Amino acid sequence: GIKNLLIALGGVLINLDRERCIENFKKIGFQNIEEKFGIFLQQEKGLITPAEFRDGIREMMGKMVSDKQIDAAWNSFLVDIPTYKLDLLLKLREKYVVYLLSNTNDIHWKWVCKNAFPYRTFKVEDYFEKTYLSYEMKMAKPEPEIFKAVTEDAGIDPKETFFIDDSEINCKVAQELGISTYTPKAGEDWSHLFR
Numbered sequence: 001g002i003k004n005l006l007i008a009l010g011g012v013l014i015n016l017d018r019e020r021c022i023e024n025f026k027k028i029g030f031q032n033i034e035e036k037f038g039i040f041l042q043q044e045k046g047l048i049t050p051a052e053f054r055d056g057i058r059e060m061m062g063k064m065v066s067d068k069q070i071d072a073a074w075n076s077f078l079v080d081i082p083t084y085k086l087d088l089l090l091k092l093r094e095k096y097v098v099y100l101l102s103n104t105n106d107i108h109w110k111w112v113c114k115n116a117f118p119y120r121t122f123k124v125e126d127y128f129e130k131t132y133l134s135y136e137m138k139m140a141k142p143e144p145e146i147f148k149a150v151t152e153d154a155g156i157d158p159k160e161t162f163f164i165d166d167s168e169i170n171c172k173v174a175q176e177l178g179i180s181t182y183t184p185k186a187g188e189d190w191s192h193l194f195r
């Protein structure tokens with residue numbers, strides 16, 4: 001009897017495009033961008049600041065570039081949330097409590113909130129009871145920490161929580177804590193889970 005849902009961000013909701021990102025980075029002067037990915041892991045845990053991140057990018061980049069240029073290229077990894085997934089979220093809150101559990105960074109998070117979640121009258125606030133972000137939490141999937149940490153703050157029973165995330169390891173760890181999981185494939189429309 002599932003009462004709650006935990007949803008990942010990437011692939012599951014927002015389409016990703018590594019090639020594009022790589023290319024945009026190269027265009028702005030980062031030659032070995034693809035070997036490079038450090039600060040990414042730190043950023044993800046919010047152990048540094050967007051400021052220091054850009055500096056790190058510049059620093060290993062060997063050139064001075066605009067923060068906008070950098071945010072631009074970094075955000076090009078994100079494509080879009082097909083709007084039918086947004087409908088699905090809203091429809092789902094009718095029968096469940098719905099949380100986001102996402103490994104991400106402030107720069108990305110602000111892009112998705114401005115550019116991807118806004119739909120009709122709705123805003124990121126409208127889809128989730130609460131969003132748990134790695135870089136705010138300071139811990140990241142698949143640390144067991146983060147899963148236990150989420151249920152306690154949320155005050156939800158793990159036995160009654162369904163976790164949807166396209167990373168196997170993340171799912172296996174969540175299962176250990178008693179959570180049920182589905183691992184969607186790239187591009188998968190996982191709406192079939194509720195037919």
Ligand SMILES: [Mg+2]
Pocket residue numbers: 008010011165166167
């Ligand atoms: Mg993923």
